[PDB]
Amino acid sequence: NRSLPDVRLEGCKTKVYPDNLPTTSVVIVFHNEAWSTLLRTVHSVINRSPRHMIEEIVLVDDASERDFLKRPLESYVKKLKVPVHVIRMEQRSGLIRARLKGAAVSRGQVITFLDAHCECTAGWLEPLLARIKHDRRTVVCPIIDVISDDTFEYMAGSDMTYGGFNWKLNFRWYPVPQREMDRRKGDRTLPVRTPTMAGGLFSIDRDYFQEIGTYDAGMDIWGGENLEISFRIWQCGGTLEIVTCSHVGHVFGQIINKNNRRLAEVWMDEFKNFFYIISPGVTKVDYGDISSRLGLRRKLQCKPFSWYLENIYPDSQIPRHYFSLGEIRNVETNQCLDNMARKENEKVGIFNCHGMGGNQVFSYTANKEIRTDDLCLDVSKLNGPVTMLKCHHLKGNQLWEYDPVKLTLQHVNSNQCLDKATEEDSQVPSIRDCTGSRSQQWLLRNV
Numbered sequence: 001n002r003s004l005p006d007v008r009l010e011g012c013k014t015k016v017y018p019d020n021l022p023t024t025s026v027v028i029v030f031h032n033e034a035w036s037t038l039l040r041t042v043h044s045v046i047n048r049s050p051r052h053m054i055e056e057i058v059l060v061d062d063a064s065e066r067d068f069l070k071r072p073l074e075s076y077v078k079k080l081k082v083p084v085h086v087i088r089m090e091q092r093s094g095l096i097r098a099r100l101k102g103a104a105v106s107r108g109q110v111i112t113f114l115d116a117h118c119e120c121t122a123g124w125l126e127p128l129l130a131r132i133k134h135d136r137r138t139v140v141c142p143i144i145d146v147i148s149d150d151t152f153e154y155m156a157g158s159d160m161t162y163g164g165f166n167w168k169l170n171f172r173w174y175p176v177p178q179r180e181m182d183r184r185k186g187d188r189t190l191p192v193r194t195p196t197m198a199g200g201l202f203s204i205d206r207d208y209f210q211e212i213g214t215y216d217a218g219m220d221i222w223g224g225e226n227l228e229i230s231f232r233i234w235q236c237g238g239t240l241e242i243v244t245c246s247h248v249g250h251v252f253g254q255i256i257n258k259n260n261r262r263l264a265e266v267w268m269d270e271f272k273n274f275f276y277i278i279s280p281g282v283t284k285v286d287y288g289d290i291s292s293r294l295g296l297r298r299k300l301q302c303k304p305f306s307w308y309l310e311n312i313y314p315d316s317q318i319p320r321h322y323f324s325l326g327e328i329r330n331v332e333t334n335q336c337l338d339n340m341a342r343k344e345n346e347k348v349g350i351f352n353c354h355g356m357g358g359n360q361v362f363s364y365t366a367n368k369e370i371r372t373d374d375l376c377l378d379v380s381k382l383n384g385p386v387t388m389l390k391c392h393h394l395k396g397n398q399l400w401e402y403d404p405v406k407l408t409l410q411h412v413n414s415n416q417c418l419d420k421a422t423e424e425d426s427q428v429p430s431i432r433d434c435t436g437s438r439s440q441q442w443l444l445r446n447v
């Protein structure tokens with residue numbers, strides 16, 4: 001234990017929570033974690049938490065190998081305020097397996113999951129439990145602050161950042177949008193409805209966890225965190241929030257795709273194609289049996305992935321409605337726009353349509369944007385270069401009007417059209433005054 005400053009939002013410091021919040025059993029799994037780091041977490045939990053709110057602390061050793069973790073730990077553990085137990089996985093298991101085990105061992109009404117490398121803030125627990133007490137079907141996440149791995153210095157995380165995800169099914173941090181600000185009328189001290197969760201840290205009602213099917217043990221153990229429990233909670237009646245008054249620190253192929261297929265085949269209905277279409281060959285990855293989970297979904301009678309995009313994640317990166325999902329082919333040159341695997345702020349290229357999806361996959365969305373995953377085609381000056389920028393959902397320079405009859409794609413702000421590449425810059429589309437050539441005619445086809 002060391003100290004920190006109060007990183008909570010001014011208003012949080014005054015809030016009073018009802019009496020008799022439930023008791024929680026923090027569950028932490030570890031693997032060869034350094035001694036100091038592991039105990040800094042343990043101590044932060046006891047010192048920063050009101051004793052009558054903590055049941056016990058369960059430390060799940062995931063088949064470590066380091067000497068100090070064995071008897072010294074147990075020794076050191078049994079001697080202190082809060083009861084701390086040390087469960088041991090016989091032969092390497094994985095986070096899911098370890099959390100499942102340490103959870104079946106806990107006895108608190110609400111289970112809190114943390115990593116072996118975290119540090120709790122002042123006032124972190126009360127707001128979490130208070131939320132769950134208001135509604136048992138609410139899963140809660142504290143704001144995740146940053147601890148350096150080198151210096152270990154502290155940097156608080158913002159209440160204006162929440163969980164989303166991209167076409168590749170990767171979890172990602174995204175800015176809280178207006179709707180969430182309008183809904184809370186500006187009071188940032190009110191919890192945020194996050195479309196997804198980092199998976200790292202969260203608290204949940206003991207009985208609610210079991211009720212929505214805990215975790216999918218069919219996923220391979222070297223996988224890790226997933227969007228899976230996030231889609232599950234929402235589509236199946238629950239509510240997932242980031243309690244902005246709670247802060248907690250954290251120090252910062254085939255396997256990955258197996259879990260993506262498992263969660264995508266089970267929850268994303270037809271939107272799973274956004275992931276498949278841009279990952280040619282991921283279809284050869286064997287993802288195991290999902291019958292059980294498919295059973296669970298029908299048992300709980302969860303709502304469609306579409307219900308989730310329009311109600312819970314309107315500012316999603318995967319479009320709920322789209323005019324096309326495929327290649328954008330120039331009718332004159334028969335070349336296709338393609339991201340060339342480049343990153344945000346980079347020039348979108350153009351090359352002969354190979355007709356094999358992937359990097360030549362684009363979507364002209366209902367929001368009139370020409371996007372590929374989380375990037376959108378952006379123009380800022382006449383004849384300027386058309387680059388791929390992070391999609392802000394505000395149109396403007398990322399607004400393109402398509403004419404399905406005339407086949408044009410004009411950039412609204414500049415008042416020009418898109419056509420074949422010019423010379424000297426032979427490998428990129430261009431934006432020029434609208435002529436009417438077959439060169440400014442594009443075919444937005446659907447796979």
Ligand SMILES: *[C@@H]1O[C@H](CO)[C@@H](O[C@@H]2O[C@H](CO)[C@@H](O[C@@H]3O[C@H](CO)[C@@H](O)[C@H](O)[C@@H]3O)[C@H](O)[C@H]2NC(C)=O)[C@H](O)[C@H]1NC(C)=O
Pocket residue numbers: 320321322323324325445446
């Ligand atoms: C590419 O695929 C998508 C979906 O497979 C095609 O868009 C879909 O178009 C249909 C018909 O226009 C849409 O259905 C309509 O939806 C409205 C909702 O307000 C409903 O009131 C109508 O009765 C009708 O059912 C559908 O929503 C839309 N799909 C999505 C996800 O946006 C698209 O046409 C295909 N590409 C092309 C243009 O060939």
Ligand SMILES: [Ca+2]
Pocket residue numbers: 213292293296
């Ligand atoms: Ca099950």
Ligand SMILES: [Ca+2]
Pocket residue numbers: 401402403404
């Ligand atoms: Ca149009």
Ligand SMILES: [Mn+2]
Pocket residue numbers: 115117200250
């Ligand atoms: Mn971690």
